[model samples]
Target: GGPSVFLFPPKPKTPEVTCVVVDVSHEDPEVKFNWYVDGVEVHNAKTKPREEQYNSLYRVVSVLTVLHQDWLNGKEYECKVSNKALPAPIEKTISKAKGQPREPQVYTLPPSRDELTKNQVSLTCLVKGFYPSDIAVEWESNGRPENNYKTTPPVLDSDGSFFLYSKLTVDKSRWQQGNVFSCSVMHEALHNHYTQKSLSLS
Candidate 1:
């Protein structure tokens, strides 16, 4: 049988680097794996020797690591699997642009009616329905960036989207003084790569 090739790109753990893996299974142990970026060959790819599997089949694994910036820039990556037993090499290609991007919905909420009477109140920012799970959230008070805020990690939804929450706690006296609080969101899917919602006690 001819060689079987599969390309896998896992969710990135950090924004600094990305790794792509290619798995190939064949009856013969003599197999070659090649990696390409934007149609040009790359030499940094590493391959593991074929390991024995069930039914006398051998599996080979190859990994390619690249900067996350390159992957986010829509660079194309290709993996080629070659063996003497096959008539032609098997190839698979992937790019970040292939995935769908969804814009996020932003909302700002003031403290509850009971909580509004307390010494301190919390303002909440909710961001929902975003794709790719990469976003930045920030808070502002009276047109200035606020440093005293907490944001939760992105949560995966049932439909493969993401949601996040950012909360800012401020003195109730500040709200009574007619101060404005805003939540700003930054995402790649947005038309301007940014959005914001503001709330004030009226």
Candidate 2:
């Protein structure tokens, strides 16, 4: 069987900073692997299949997952790939971000059918786990505000960390079938402002 793979976040970032993330899967068998770092061969060549996959972004490494969360104190890094069949490792695109968190767990709304029945429905979006708790969260509908969410519906929670969350609710009884609902966040880090996520409802 061939490797079954998928790529997501078509535009994933380095978990922080400049945004560059992607996921790949494969099932190619009997493959020799090698990884490259900054165009140079990684020092440790052979390990477990999981170890070999840690090589550069090229095809040689056949690991189930790849992450840069364990970056050393000071080093510029990149991804490359190489398999036994190929003479050299292949490198993936370099990230434009610098000094980004090696790995970040971004909060995301779950995926579900947008089909809503005409009833008093509720929708909420919350964000937590950020370093500085000073964050602003809001619920908006098609760029407007829904009175119900501002008053009741979803509740806000503070986990007692530099983290907070807001919820919004709605009455779907009068909700239109094709209209959209959304939530957004605005936050700051060391004077640098950062904004992320805009949950949408349709």
**Top of the candidates by TM-score:** 1
Q: Estimate the overall C-alpha local distance difference test score of candidate 2.
A: 0.38
Count of steric clashes across candidates, in order: 0, 21
Model 1 lDDT, residue 128, Cα? 95
Q: Give TM-scores for every candidate, taking all chains together and pairing residue i with residue i.
A: 0.55, 0.34
C-alpha positional error of residue 137 in candidate 1 after TM-score superposition, expressed in Å: 0.7
Give the Å shift of residue 187 in candidate 1.
0.4
**Candidate 2 minimal-lDDT segment of 10 residues:** 1-10
Candidate 2 residue-wise lDDT, 1-202, digit = tens:
1121111111233332111112122332234334444455454434333322332232223332234452332333444443443455443332323322222122535233453543555555555544332346666666786565542211223532233345555555544454466665555442234444455444
Worst 10 residues of 1 by lDDT: 15-24
Q: Report, for every candidate in turn, its global Cα lDDT versus the true structure.
A: 0.75, 0.38
